[PDB]
PDB file of C-alpha atoms in Angstrom:
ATOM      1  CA  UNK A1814     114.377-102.732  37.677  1.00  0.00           C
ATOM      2  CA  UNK A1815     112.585-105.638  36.551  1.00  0.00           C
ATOM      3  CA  UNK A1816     112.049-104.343  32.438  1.00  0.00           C
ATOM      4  CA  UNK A1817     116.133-104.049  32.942  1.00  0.00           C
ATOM      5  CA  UNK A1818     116.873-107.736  34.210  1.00  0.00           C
ATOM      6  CA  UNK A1819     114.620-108.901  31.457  1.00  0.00           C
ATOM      7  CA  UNK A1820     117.367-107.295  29.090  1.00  0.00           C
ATOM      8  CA  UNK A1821     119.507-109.545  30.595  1.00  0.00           C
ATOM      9  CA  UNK A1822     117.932-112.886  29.149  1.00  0.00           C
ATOM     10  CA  UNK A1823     119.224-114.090  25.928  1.00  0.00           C
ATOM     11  CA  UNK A1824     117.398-111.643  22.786  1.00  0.00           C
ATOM     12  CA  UNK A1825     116.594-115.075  21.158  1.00  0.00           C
ATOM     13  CA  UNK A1826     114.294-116.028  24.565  1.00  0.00           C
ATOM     14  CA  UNK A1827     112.597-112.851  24.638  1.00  0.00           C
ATOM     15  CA  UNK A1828     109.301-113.126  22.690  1.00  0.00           C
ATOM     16  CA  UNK A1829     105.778-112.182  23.210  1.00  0.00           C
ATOM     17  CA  UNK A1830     102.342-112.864  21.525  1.00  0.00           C
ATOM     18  CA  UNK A1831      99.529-111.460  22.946  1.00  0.00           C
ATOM     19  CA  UNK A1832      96.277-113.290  23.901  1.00  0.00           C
ATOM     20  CA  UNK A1833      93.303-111.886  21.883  1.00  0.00           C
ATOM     21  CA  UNK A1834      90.752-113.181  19.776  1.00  0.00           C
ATOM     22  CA  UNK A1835      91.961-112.514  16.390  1.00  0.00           C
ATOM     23  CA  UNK A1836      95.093-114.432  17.843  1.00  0.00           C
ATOM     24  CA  UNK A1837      93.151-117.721  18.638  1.00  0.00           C
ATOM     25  CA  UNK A1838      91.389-117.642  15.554  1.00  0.00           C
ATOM     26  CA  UNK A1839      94.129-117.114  13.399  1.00  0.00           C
ATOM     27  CA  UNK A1840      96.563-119.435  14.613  1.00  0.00           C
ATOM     28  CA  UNK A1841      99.279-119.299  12.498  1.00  0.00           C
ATOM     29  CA  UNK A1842     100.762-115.791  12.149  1.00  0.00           C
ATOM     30  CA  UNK A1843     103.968-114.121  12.922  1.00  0.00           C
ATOM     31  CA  UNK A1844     104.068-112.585  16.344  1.00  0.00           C
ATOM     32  CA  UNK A1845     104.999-109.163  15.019  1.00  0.00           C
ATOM     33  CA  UNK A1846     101.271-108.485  13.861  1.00  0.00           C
ATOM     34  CA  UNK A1847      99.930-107.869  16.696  1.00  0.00           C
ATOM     35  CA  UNK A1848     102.174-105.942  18.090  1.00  0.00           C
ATOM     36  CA  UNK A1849     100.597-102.107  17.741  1.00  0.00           C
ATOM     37  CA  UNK A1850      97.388-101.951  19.650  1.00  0.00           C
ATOM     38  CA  UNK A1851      97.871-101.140  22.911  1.00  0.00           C
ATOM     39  CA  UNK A1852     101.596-101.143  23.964  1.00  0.00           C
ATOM     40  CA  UNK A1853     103.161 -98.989  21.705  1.00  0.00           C
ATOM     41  CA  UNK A1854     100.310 -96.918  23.003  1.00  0.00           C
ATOM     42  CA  UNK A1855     102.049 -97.296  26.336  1.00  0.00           C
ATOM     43  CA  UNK A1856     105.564 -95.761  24.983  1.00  0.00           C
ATOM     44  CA  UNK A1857     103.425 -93.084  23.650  1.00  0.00           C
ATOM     45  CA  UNK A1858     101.612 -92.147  26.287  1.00  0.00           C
ATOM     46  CA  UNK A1859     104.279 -92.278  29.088  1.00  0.00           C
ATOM     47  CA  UNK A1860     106.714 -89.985  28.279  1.00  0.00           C
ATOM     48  CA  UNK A1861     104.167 -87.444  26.845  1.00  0.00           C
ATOM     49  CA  UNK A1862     101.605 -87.524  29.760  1.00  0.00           C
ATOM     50  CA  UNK A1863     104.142 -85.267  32.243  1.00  0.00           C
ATOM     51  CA  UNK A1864     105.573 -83.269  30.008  1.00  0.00           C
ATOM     52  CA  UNK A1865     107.438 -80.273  31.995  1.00  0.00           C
ATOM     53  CA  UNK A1866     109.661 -78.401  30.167  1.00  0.00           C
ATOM     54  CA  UNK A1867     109.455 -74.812  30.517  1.00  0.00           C
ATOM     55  CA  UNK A1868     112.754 -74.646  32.245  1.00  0.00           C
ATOM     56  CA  UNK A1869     116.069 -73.724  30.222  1.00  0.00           C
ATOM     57  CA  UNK A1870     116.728 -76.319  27.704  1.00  0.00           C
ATOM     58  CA  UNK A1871     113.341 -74.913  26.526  1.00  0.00           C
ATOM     59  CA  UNK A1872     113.483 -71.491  27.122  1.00  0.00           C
ATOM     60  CA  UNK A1873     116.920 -71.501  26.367  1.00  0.00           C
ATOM     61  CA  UNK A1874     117.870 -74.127  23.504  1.00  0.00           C
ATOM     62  CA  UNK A1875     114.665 -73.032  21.960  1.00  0.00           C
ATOM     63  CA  UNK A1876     114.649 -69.106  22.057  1.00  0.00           C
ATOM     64  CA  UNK A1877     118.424 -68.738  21.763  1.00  0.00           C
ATOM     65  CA  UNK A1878     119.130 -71.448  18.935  1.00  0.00           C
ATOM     66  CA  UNK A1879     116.118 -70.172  16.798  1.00  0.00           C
ATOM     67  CA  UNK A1880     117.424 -66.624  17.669  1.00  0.00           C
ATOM     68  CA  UNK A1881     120.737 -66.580  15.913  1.00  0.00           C
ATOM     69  CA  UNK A1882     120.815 -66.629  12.618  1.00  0.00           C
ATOM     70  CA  UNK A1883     122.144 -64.978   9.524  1.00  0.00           C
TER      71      UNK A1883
ATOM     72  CA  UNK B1062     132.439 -28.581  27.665  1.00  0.00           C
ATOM     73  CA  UNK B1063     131.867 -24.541  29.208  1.00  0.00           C
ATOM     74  CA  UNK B1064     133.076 -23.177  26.097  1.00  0.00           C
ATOM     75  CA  UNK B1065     130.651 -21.139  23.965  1.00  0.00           C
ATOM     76  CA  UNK B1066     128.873 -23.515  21.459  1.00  0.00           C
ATOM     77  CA  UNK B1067     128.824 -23.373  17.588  1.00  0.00           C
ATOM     78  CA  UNK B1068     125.272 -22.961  15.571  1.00  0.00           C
ATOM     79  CA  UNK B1069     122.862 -24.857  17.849  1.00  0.00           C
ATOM     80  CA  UNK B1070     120.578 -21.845  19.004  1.00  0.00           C
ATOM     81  CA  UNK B1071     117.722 -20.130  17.502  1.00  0.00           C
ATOM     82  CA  UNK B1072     119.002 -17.695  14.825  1.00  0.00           C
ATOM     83  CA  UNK B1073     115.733 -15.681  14.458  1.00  0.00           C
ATOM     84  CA  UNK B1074     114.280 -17.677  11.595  1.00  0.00           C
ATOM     85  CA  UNK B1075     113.234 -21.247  11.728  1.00  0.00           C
ATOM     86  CA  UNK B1076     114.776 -23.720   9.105  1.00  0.00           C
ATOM     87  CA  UNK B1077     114.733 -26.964   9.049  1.00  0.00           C
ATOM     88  CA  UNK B1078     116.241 -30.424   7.536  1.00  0.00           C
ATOM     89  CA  UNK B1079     113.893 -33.342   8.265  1.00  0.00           C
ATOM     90  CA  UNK B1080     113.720 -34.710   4.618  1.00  0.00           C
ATOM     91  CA  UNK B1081     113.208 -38.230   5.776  1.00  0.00           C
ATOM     92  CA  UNK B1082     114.421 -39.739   2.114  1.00  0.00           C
ATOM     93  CA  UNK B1083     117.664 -37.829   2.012  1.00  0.00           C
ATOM     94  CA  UNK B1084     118.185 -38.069   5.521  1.00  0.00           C
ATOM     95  CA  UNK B1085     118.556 -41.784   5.138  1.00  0.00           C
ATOM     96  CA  UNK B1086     121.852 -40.657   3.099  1.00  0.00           C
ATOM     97  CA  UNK B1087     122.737 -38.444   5.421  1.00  0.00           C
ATOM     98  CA  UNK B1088     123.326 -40.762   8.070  1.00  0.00           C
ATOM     99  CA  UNK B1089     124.681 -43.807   6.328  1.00  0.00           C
ATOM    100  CA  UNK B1090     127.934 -40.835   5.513  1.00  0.00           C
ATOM    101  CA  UNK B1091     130.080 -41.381   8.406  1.00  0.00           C
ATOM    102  CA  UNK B1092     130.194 -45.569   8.809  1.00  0.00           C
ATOM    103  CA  UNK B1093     133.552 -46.752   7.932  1.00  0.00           C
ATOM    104  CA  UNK B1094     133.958 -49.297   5.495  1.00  0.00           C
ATOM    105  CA  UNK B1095     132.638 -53.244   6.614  1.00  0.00           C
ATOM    106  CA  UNK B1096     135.701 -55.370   6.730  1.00  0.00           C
ATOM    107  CA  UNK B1097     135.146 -59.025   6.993  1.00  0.00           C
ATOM    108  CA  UNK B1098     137.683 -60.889   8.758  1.00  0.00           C
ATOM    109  CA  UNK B1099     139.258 -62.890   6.095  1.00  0.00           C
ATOM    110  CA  UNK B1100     139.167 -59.563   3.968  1.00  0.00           C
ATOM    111  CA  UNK B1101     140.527 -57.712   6.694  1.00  0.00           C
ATOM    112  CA  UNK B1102     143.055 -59.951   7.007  1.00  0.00           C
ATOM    113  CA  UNK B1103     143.972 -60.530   3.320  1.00  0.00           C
ATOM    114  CA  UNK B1104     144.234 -56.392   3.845  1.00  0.00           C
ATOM    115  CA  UNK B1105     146.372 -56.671   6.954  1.00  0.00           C
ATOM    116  CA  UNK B1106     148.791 -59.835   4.889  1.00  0.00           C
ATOM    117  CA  UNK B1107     148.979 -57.220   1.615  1.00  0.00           C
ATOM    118  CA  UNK B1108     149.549 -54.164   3.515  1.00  0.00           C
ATOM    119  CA  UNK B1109     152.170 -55.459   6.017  1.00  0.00           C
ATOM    120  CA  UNK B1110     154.462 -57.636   2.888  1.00  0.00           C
ATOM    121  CA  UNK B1111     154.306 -55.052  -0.293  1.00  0.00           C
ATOM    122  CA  UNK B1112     155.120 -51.474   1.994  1.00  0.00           C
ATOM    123  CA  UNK B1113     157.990 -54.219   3.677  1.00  0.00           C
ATOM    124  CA  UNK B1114     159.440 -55.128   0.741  1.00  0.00           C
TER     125      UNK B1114
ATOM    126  CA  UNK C 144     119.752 -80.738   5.536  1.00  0.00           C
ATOM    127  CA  UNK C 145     123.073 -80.218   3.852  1.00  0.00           C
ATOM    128  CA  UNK C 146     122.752 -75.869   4.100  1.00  0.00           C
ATOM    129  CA  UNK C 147     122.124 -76.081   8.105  1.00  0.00           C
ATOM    130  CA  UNK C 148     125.352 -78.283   8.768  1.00  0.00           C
ATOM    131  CA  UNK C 149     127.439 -76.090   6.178  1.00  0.00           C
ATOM    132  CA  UNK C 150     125.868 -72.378   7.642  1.00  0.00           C
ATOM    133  CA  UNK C 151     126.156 -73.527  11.153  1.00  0.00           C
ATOM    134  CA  UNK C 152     129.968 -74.448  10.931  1.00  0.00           C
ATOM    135  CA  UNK C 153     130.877 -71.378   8.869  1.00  0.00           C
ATOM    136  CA  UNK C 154     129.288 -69.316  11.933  1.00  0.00           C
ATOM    137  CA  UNK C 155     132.267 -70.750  14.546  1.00  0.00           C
ATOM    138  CA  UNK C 156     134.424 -70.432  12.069  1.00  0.00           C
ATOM    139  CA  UNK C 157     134.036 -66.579  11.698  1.00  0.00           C
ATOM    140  CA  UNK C 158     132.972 -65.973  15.364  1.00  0.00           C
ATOM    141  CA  UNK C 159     136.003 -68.023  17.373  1.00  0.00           C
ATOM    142  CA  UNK C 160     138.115 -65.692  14.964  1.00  0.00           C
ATOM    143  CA  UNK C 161     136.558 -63.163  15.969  1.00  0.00           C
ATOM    144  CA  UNK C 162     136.527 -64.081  19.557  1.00  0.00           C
ATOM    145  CA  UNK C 163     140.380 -64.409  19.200  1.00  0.00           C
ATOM    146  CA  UNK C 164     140.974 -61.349  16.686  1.00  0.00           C
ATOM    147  CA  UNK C 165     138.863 -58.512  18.211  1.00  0.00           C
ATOM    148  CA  UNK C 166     140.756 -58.893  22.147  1.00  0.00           C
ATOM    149  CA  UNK C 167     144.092 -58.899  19.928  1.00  0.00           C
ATOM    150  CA  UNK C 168     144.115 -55.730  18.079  1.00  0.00           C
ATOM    151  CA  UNK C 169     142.191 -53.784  20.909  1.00  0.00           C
ATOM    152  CA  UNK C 170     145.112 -54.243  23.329  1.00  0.00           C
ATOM    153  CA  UNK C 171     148.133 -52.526  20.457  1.00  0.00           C
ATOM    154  CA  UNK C 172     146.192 -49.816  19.184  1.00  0.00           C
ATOM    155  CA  UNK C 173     144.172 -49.859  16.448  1.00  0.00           C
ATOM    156  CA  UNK C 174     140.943 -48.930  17.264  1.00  0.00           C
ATOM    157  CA  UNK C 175     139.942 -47.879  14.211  1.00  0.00           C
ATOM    158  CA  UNK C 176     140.610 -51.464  12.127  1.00  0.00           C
ATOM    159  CA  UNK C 177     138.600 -53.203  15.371  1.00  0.00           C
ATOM    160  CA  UNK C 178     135.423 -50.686  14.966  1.00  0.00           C
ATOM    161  CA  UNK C 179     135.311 -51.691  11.133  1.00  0.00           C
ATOM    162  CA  UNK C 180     135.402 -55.162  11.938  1.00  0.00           C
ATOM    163  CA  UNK C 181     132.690 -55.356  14.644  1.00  0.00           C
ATOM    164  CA  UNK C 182     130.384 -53.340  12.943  1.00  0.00           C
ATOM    165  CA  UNK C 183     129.803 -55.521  10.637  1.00  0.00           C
ATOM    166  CA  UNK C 184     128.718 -58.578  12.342  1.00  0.00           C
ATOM    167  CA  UNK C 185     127.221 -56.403  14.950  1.00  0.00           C
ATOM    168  CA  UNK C 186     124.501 -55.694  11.696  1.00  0.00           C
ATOM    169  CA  UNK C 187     124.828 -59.474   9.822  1.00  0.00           C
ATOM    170  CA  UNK C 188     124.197 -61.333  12.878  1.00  0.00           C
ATOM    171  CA  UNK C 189     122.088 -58.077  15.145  1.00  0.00           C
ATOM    172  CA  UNK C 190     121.066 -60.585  18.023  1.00  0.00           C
ATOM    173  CA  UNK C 191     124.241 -61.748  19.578  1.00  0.00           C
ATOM    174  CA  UNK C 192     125.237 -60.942  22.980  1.00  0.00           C
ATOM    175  CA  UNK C 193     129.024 -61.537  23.245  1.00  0.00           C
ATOM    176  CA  UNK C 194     129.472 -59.261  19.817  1.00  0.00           C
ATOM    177  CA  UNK C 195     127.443 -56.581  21.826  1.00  0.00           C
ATOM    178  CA  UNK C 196     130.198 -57.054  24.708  1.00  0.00           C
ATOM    179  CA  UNK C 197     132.973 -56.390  22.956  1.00  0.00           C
ATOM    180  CA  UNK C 198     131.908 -53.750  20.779  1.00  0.00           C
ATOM    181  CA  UNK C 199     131.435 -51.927  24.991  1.00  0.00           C
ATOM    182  CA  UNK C 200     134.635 -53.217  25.786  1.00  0.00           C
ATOM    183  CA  UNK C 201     136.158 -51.401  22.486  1.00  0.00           C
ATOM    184  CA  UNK C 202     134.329 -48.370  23.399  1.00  0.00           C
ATOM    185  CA  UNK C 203     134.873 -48.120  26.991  1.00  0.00           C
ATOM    186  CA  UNK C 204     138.950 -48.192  26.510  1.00  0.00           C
ATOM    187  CA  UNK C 205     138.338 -45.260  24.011  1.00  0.00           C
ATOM    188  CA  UNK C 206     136.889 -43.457  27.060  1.00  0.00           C
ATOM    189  CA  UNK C 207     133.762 -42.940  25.135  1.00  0.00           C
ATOM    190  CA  UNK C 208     131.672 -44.158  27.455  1.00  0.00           C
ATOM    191  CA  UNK C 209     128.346 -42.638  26.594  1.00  0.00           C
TER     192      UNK C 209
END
């Protein structure tokens, strides 16, 4: 709900820099390298963590794509 | 179905045909041919306008 | 990527005339033409179920149904 209505701001007043040491230290940098460390790590981890499957669309678009051939 | 079969008994001796390299022959021998739709079509197009004409 | 695109499109191509071929000639005769043109794809592509389904129904209206 609330990630969505933050979509809604202008794109131009959406930025983020992250507090950390290497960011007080060095000042001056763009905002884009810092970016990796640990939140990209969060739209790994999310959607792999559950990870279901196992139903058709997996036993089905799996076995019966890979099953016709020529 | 009750009528009385052909050769499939016994006939004394034993005889065989196993012959597992010219049995392979032996079976392919009653497939028809392997049309593929665009060539059994371009037979069905040939067949049906040079007999019509 | 170019051979998966152009394989996978000639495979519909064939098969939905096939799908619309086969339940033609099987209702005005001509069983014979419709057994030489299953049996091939029947062997080229051996895993298919719907080619399986109407190779039975071409069978079954020949009354062999062994």
């Amino acid at each position: 709900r609330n990630s969505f209505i933050r979509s809604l701001r202008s794109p131009a007043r959406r930025r983020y820099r992250p507090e950390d040491s290497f960011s007080q230290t060095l000042w001056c940098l763009p905002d884009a390298f810092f970016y990796d460390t640990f939140h990209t790590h969060g739209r790994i981890i999310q959607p792999d963590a559950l990870h279901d499957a196992l139903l058709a669309h997996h036993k089905r678009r799996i076995e019966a794509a890979a099953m016709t051939r020529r | 179905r009750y009528a009385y079969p052909e050769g499939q008994f016994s006939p004394g001796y034993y005889v065989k045909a196993a012959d597992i390299d010219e049995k392979r022959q032996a079976i392919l021998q009653a497939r028809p041919p392997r049309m593929s739709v665009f060539e059994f079509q371009e037979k069905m197009r040939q067949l049906k306008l040079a007999k019509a004409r | 990527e170019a051979v998966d695109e152009s394989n996978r499109q000639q495979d519909e191509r064939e098969l939905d005339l096939v799908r619309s071929t086969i339940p033609k000639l099987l209702s005005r005769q001509q069983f014979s033409d419709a057994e030489s043109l299953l049996e091939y794809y029947l062997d080229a592509f051996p895993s298919r179920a719907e080619l399986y389904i109407l190779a039975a129904d071409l069978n079954l209206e020949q009354k062999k149904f062994s």
